[PDB]
Scaffold this active site. Structure first.
Site, PDB file in Angstrom:
ATOM      1  N   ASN A  26       0.880  -1.170   0.000  1.00 46.16           N
ATOM      2  CA  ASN A  26       0.000   0.000   0.000  1.00 46.16           C
ATOM      3  C   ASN A  26       0.919   1.221   0.000  1.00 46.16           C
ATOM      4  OD1 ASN A  26      -1.456   2.324   0.872  1.00 46.16           O
ATOM      5  ND2 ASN A  26      -3.135   1.037   1.606  1.00 46.16           N
ATOM      6  N   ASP A  28       0.157   4.355  -0.650  1.00 43.56           N
ATOM      7  CA  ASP A  28      -0.454   5.535  -0.062  1.00 43.56           C
ATOM      8  C   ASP A  28      -0.112   6.802  -0.862  1.00 43.56           C
ATOM      9  OD1 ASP A  28      -1.850   6.560   2.596  1.00 43.56           O
ATOM     10  OD2 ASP A  28      -0.186   7.945   2.147  1.00 43.56           O
ATOM     11  N   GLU A  54      -3.826   1.728  -3.071  1.00 42.93           N
ATOM     12  CA  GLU A  54      -4.042   3.142  -2.761  1.00 42.93           C
ATOM     13  C   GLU A  54      -3.066   4.016  -3.556  1.00 42.93           C
ATOM     14  OE1 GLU A  54      -4.342   3.926   1.337  1.00 42.93           O
ATOM     15  OE2 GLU A  54      -5.033   6.011   1.064  1.00 42.93           O
ATOM     16  N   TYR A 129      -7.674  -3.656  -2.237  1.00 40.36           N
ATOM     17  CA  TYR A 129      -7.609  -2.547  -1.282  1.00 40.36           C
ATOM     18  C   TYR A 129      -9.019  -2.473  -0.702  1.00 40.36           C
ATOM     19  CZ  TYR A 129      -7.217   2.321   0.387  1.00 40.36           C
ATOM     20  OH  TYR A 129      -7.241   3.465   1.136  1.00 40.36           O
ATOM     21  N   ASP A 168      -4.113  -4.869   1.151  1.00 41.41           N
ATOM     22  CA  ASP A 168      -4.508  -4.206   2.376  1.00 41.41           C
ATOM     23  C   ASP A 168      -5.920  -4.675   2.653  1.00 41.41           C
ATOM     24  OD1 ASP A 168      -5.218  -2.515   4.454  1.00 41.41           O
ATOM     25  OD2 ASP A 168      -4.379  -0.711   3.540  1.00 41.41           O
ATOM     26  N   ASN A 170      -7.420  -4.222   5.535  1.00 40.49           N
ATOM     27  CA  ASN A 170      -8.028  -3.189   6.383  1.00 40.49           C
ATOM     28  C   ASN A 170      -8.737  -3.815   7.585  1.00 40.49           C
ATOM     29  OD1 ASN A 170      -7.768  -0.269   6.149  1.00 40.49           O
ATOM     30  ND2 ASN A 170      -8.371  -0.506   3.989  1.00 40.49           N
ATOM     31  N   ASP A 241      -1.905  -5.857   6.036  1.00 42.39           N
ATOM     32  CA  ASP A 241      -1.524  -6.312   4.715  1.00 42.39           C
ATOM     33  C   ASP A 241      -1.174  -7.795   4.803  1.00 42.39           C
ATOM     34  OD1 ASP A 241      -0.720  -3.244   5.099  1.00 42.39           O
ATOM     35  OD2 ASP A 241      -1.050  -3.617   2.941  1.00 42.39           O
ATOM     36  N   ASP A 266       2.867   4.879   4.718  1.00 44.40           N
ATOM     37  CA  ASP A 266       2.560   4.487   6.092  1.00 44.40           C
ATOM     38  C   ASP A 266       2.283   2.988   6.214  1.00 44.40           C
ATOM     39  OD1 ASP A 266       0.198   4.791   4.683  1.00 44.40           O
ATOM     40  OD2 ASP A 266      -0.848   5.969   6.223  1.00 44.40           O
ATOM     41  N   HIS A 267       2.447   2.239   5.127  1.00 47.89           N
ATOM     42  CA  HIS A 267       2.563   0.794   5.174  1.00 47.89           C
ATOM     43  C   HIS A 267       3.962   0.380   4.746  1.00 47.89           C
ATOM     44  CE1 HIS A 267      -1.969  -0.072   4.987  1.00 47.89           C
ATOM     45  NE2 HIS A 267      -1.842   1.241   4.952  1.00 47.89           N
TER      46      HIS A 267
HETATM   47 MN   LIG Z   1      -3.472   5.892   3.198  1.00 40.83          MN
END
Ligand SMILES: [Mn+2]
Ligand SMILES: [Mn+2]
Length: 276
Positions: A26, A28, A54, A129, A168, A170, A241, A266-267
DNA sequence: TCGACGGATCC
DNA sequence: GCTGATGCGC
DNA sequence: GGATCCGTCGATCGCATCAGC
């Protein structure tokens, strides 16, 4: 406490060498991730397949560096149909797949560029995602609807070929999958409804959590940390993930890694080794 | 995620 | 291009 | 009645958009 991923195991439980290396990330924000030297990391990892989540980047705006990338020359991208700079996934492969498709076959769920299905010789790859339940849990009702449709789609798919699902998802499945389980039971990613959906995904398809299958009692192993409060430097994070596998591929499983030190999002990225 | 607020409730 | 404001997210 | 607890409830970081020009 901090975490150090153990070395890569590159033989199968019968000692067959790993032939296939899949990396999922991910990023981001694809453009920001490339500016933060993400592709440098990808080139050193040298996966056979790279799944991104993402991307937040239309097909027009995809930077040029992605064309000059000849270990991953077959590239596929999905963006939302009417929502720019949001969601988006891509799949880059060294070898062209037999067949590639977007979405899961349900109009309601295929508008936010979240799923790419790539069929190869011996297996099908899904990268995904999954929709976040949101701040204040505003999308929790929608996420449970997504979870049920996604589960039914993957169950169908796995009845025809062995399935690898990555991305991801989530949700942190169990309390060991995040740093602050108590403080987060009414927060996106760790509601009882999201934890149950994951459990029913594992059971109904069926699928196995590759990483947890090999390290069933390893704590502090996370794939995400909020940018806020410098969470990453304290390893206050979540495992969001995953590589989920058809049970039939469990004897092809060599290792399921967490690349905690690759920066740029941030992953962090995750890496799968299979003997096929 | 964190600290700051509350409003409890015990010693 | 540039400012300032909003959407989104564990 | 002064001290620890315990449930909310705001302000952080980072990316990408949009409205206006
Ligand atoms: Mn994000
Ligand atoms: Mn408390």
């Amino acid at each position: 406490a901090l975490y150090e991923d153990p070395p890569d195991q590159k033989t199968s439980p019968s000692g067959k060498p790993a032939t296939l290396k899949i990396c999922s990330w991910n990023v981001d924000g694809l453009r920001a991730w490339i500016k933060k030297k993400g592709l440098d990391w990808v080139k050193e990892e040298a996966p056979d397949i790279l799944c991104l989540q993402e991307t937040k980047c239309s097909e027009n705006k995809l930077p040029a560096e992605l064309q000059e990338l000849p270990g991953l020359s077959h590239q596929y991208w999905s963006a939302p149909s009417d929502k720019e700079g949001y969601s988006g996934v891509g799949l880059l492969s060294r070898q062209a797949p037999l067949k590639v498709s977007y979405g899961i076959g349900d109009e309601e769920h295929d508008q936010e560029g979240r799923v790419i299905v790539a069929e190869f010789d011996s297996f099908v790859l899904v990268t995904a995602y999954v929709p976040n339940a949101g701040r204040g849990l505003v999308r929790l009702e929608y996420r449970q609807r997504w979870d049920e449709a996604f589960r039914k789609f993957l169950k169908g798919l796995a009845s025809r070929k062995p399935l690898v699902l990555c991305g991801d998802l989530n949700v942190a499945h169990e309390e060991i999958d995040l740093r602050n389980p108590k403080g987060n039971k009414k927060n996106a990613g760790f509601t009882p409804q999201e934890r149950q959906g994951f459990g029913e995904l594992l059971q109904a398809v069926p699928l196995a959590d590759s990483f947890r299958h090999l390290y069933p009692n390893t704590p502090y192993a996370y794939t995400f940390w909020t940018y806020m409060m410098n969470a990453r430097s304290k390893n206050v994070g979540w495992r969001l993930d995953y590589f989920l596998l058809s049970h039939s591929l469990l004897p092809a499983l060599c290792d399921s890694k967490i690349r905690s030190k690759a920066l740029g999002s941030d992953h962090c990225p995750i890496t799968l080794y299979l003997a096929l």
